[PDB]
Assembly symmetry: D3
């Protein structure tokens, strides 16, 4: 029974994230999206709002489930009987940074990490940049799933 | 049901490669190692030699097989009913180059690519560098599987 | 009637920035320097002031403060090009995403120029940090800014 | 009377190149595409030909072959700007050295533009390699080049 | 006669750092480890603790001494009659950032910087990441010298 | 007695190289410039011509000597009782490539590598680009030492 965990804050989930979810779900028997809460940086959406937006956007992925998590990511992964993390990468800079975390995670817990390259169309999309653009009235509707931009309107007003 | 292809020239396979094979075999139901041959440029080892060296050092991986091929990698993958490539990466430079190839491969054939970070211990190991060092008498024993080391020194002499 | 906008915080403006201004003014009929009001050592007005003195010899350049989306600043003045300097591959990877976002949302393009070799290590932040602990940044900043920097720390 | 030169081997010209041509023509009064005669699949004349057909709708652009120093090509036509597309940070680091060399020896500046996201993975060499082994590169090349590519391999 | 300064916050020193100290001490007549303190932001360990942890794990290096400092690194270096900084680097990203600092340091004070590549085994080790992993219960024992591990777990509790 | 080897083809030596030589000679009791011959790529200048140009350019560095070398670099270094290599770096890309060679050299022979950042003024200078520019009539006189550009005129005519 194969599987992997896709970690992130997803505040909010973007089409870049969604593309990674779809690609992981096509290759693993199960995927768990882990919505990670930092009590320092309270973002725009609550953890429940983020989970709901991810579930709506992944409605057609039957082997994908979404949960919140806290603490050590590798503990979250092992607690669920898995030992793989899947993450999207956009740049070589991203790779150099994630490489250190991947090696640390494999060292401390034997959990592996599989990376996928961003889809070309979403290479410049990030939750943070989309929010910043939207805050000043930019149209990011083509960068976010449908279930998100509606809720994003509400938060900005 | 789930599966991946691990491609390369493997001339010869290194411990860096074997680490990637082992990690792929742990996460996918089957792995096929694709020894890709350019029919116009010969390398150091024959196809038979390349395949034998990989088989000898992967005997403990029951769900891994080894095959040679040529032409487009995505055709090799799809012909076998698979849809995933797994590749190791050492550097950000590697990632930027492989990103292009992975995006092209997804574009023309819908085949996805999963990258894994090199094991720290083997981060500087490459077939080409190991051959070059060995050519001038350097000690590469701890970098190559036993199935490879004496076959390499044999070629060199 | 070509034109480009050179955006930044410019706190203060360095010779590195000035070099980009000069090169942009040489290739576009009109250049506007956009001081984006956001950290901070100088007032937006002093920044603008400091840029204005360093740029006296450039007839087709002017300096304006800005708020909100950079692409709105650019389009509201009838332009659709941004010119920015780059020092490193890391800079490029970061800037590429903003460039692509800006083109996507507003059709504003971005042209990058390589740093002058002499100014490869110059940044507003590093120049401040070094001047803070008494280091000589004279050769890195416009004469204009150099005095106002010494007096801002004294 | 602004202007820029877009240099390359263009063998063949890709939609990635075309996108840069379009963006350069939008910001400079005059753009010259320089086909530098140096590997090779198409003749310099076909390359030039193939670029000319893809660029019909751009009135301020022309296509010329070139030999020797790029900066001499640029200056001999009265210009001192080069426009080139960049995909990656690795590209930038390589191109930065040539940009700085070109500025040093001839005072010719270089403006870089970020690849369009859709064409991030498109290169002349990769498109050829894939078309060689039967892959469909239709959506990546101009309709002009696409037929001449199919007939060049058949 | 020849000498170098190895600077850092060392909060705490890691095996990655100690590897750099050892390699510097092998190549220069003397090495001074400079524990640079920001008087406005405290870290996890006091200056006394930082110095003690480094001394305890460098006892076998007769030509290495440890001192704290603050303000400009180049003043610390020149005051001691030296003219060289030695720093470890892990990534190309690190190199691009440190290049700027090294060129500035040479510009303002004529002080040169020599970089050394990280040991492969410690390529993913950083004080900050080790603290973060330890904070959430991860096993960082093989990444830190013995002089550090129990002092860190003590702080955390 | 401290020391390091500065390897390269130096065909011809540039001011970028010279800057590295000067900086190594300021920090090590002795520096050996190793002019490495590849029988495949016969460059523009013979090995003796290159050594002569380097000696003339380093005339004021009394602790620097110049020799030709072949074979494994780490053997060259150890044969002369040293165990350090000094190399200049221009870019993060250069660092990622040299990092692998440095780790390999330390693995196979215990020889370390110290890198220095390029001087800002010479960041875009390389022997290959200077030759290419000069070949088509570009003025590279400000990029090369005096003892070189004269000989470079002769070779081009
Ligand atoms: N356009 C895109 N394509 C592919 N992957 C992407 C992507 N945008 C983001 N990702 C990936 O999705 C991960 C999770 O995204 P987010 O949750 O929004 C960032 P975060 O980890 O919560 O905060 P951070 O910025 O401090 O790292 C990122 O770390 C990145 O790996
Ligand atoms: N030390 C290492 N750790 C992890 N992966 C490695 C590795 N060394 C090589 N690899 C991977 O193994 C792949 C195949 O290596 P080789 O067969 O030796 C040369 P290649 O097949 O021509 O690779 P390339 O053309 O994709 O660059 C590399 O592309 C790289 O992805
Ligand atoms: N030495 C240099 N040469 C060429 N361009 C430079 C340069 N230094 C900076 N620039 C460019 O000019 C822009 C403006 O820089 P500044 O606004 O003064 C500081 P900043 O790095 O932008 O702050 P930030 O990182 O917090 O956003 C930079 O973002 C960069 O694009
Ligand atoms: N997808 C893309 N988007 C934007 N610009 C691109 C691009 N692909 C290529 N370019 C730019 O257009 C230039 C011309 O490329 P080409 O001449 O066709 C192949 P090349 O990479 O230059 O060959 P070479 O590497 O052997 O020198 C590239 O050097 C690059 O600067
Ligand atoms: N695993 C490793 N291998 C080699 N060198 C390392 C290393 N980890 C850290 N270093 C080096 O040791 C230096 C000091 O590390 P630390 O004191 O922990 C944070 P720092 O002092 O704030 O570094 P920085 O500000 O220069 O980025 C780093 O700058 C880096 O050069
Ligand atoms: N401008 C510069 N500043 C600092 N260091 C430089 C430099 N130009 C070159 N170097 C360094 O000097 C070394 C030797 O230079 P060269 O001998 O000319 C290259 P090479 O190793 O002979 O051939 P190669 O290009 O196949 O690597 C380079 O590997 C590089 O480390
Ligand atoms: C949330 C994240 C995955 C951030 O990485 P990301 O930016 O790729 O999403 C990382 O911070 C994390 O793993 N948090 C859980 C705590 C942890 O395991 N830290 C140690 C990572 S080596
Ligand atoms: C280009 C490459 C060397 C890379 O794959 P490999 O290093 O794993 O063998 C080659 O073997 C391959 O993957 N396929 C053969 C030609 C091809 O597939 N070209 C399209 C790459 S997008
Ligand atoms: C100010 C700046 C240009 C960054 O400039 P800087 O790198 O000089 O700090 C960028 O942060 C910006 O555009 N701010 C205005 C708000 C905006 O346009 N956000 C969307 C960026 S895609
Ligand atoms: C042709 C090109 C622009 C490279 O273009 P390309 O990346 O598209 O192949 C470059 O090789 C060139 O300028 N050739 C002409 C000779 C020259 O100018 N050499 C000095 C470069 S600094
Ligand atoms: C910026 C830095 C953190 C880097 O040095 P460090 O990481 O080795 O401690 C700092 O401690 C330092 O080197 N000096 C203190 C301020 C300074 O020197 N600024 C000038 C750097 S060019
Ligand atoms: C000549 C050089 C130093 C090239 O590196 P460089 O480009 O930095 O000069 C390298 O090829 C070399 O070391 N040649 C000697 C043979 C050798 O030792 N090869 C193994 C290097 S790990």
């Amino acid at each position: 029974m194969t599987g992997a965990v896709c970690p992130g804050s997803f505040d909010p989930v973007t089409l870049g994230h969604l593309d990674v979810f779809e690609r992981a779900a096509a290759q693993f028997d199960e995927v768990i999206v882990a919505v990670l809460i930092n009590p320092n940086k309270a973002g725009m959406f609550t953890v429940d709002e983020r989970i709901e937006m991810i579930r709506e956007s992944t409605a057609d992925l039957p082997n994908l489930r979404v949960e919140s998590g806290q603490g050590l990511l590798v503990d979250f992964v092992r607690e669920r009987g898995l030992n793989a993390i899947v993450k999207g990468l956009r740049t070589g800079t991203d790779f150099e940074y994630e490489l250190q975390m991947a090696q640390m995670n494999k060292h401390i817990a034997g959990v592996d990490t599989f990376f996928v390259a961003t889809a070309p169309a979403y290479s410049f999309v990030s939750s943070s940049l989309a929010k910043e653009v939207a805050t000043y009235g930019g149209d990011v509707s083509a960068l976010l799933p449908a279930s998100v931009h509606q809720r994003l309107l509400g938060k900005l007003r």
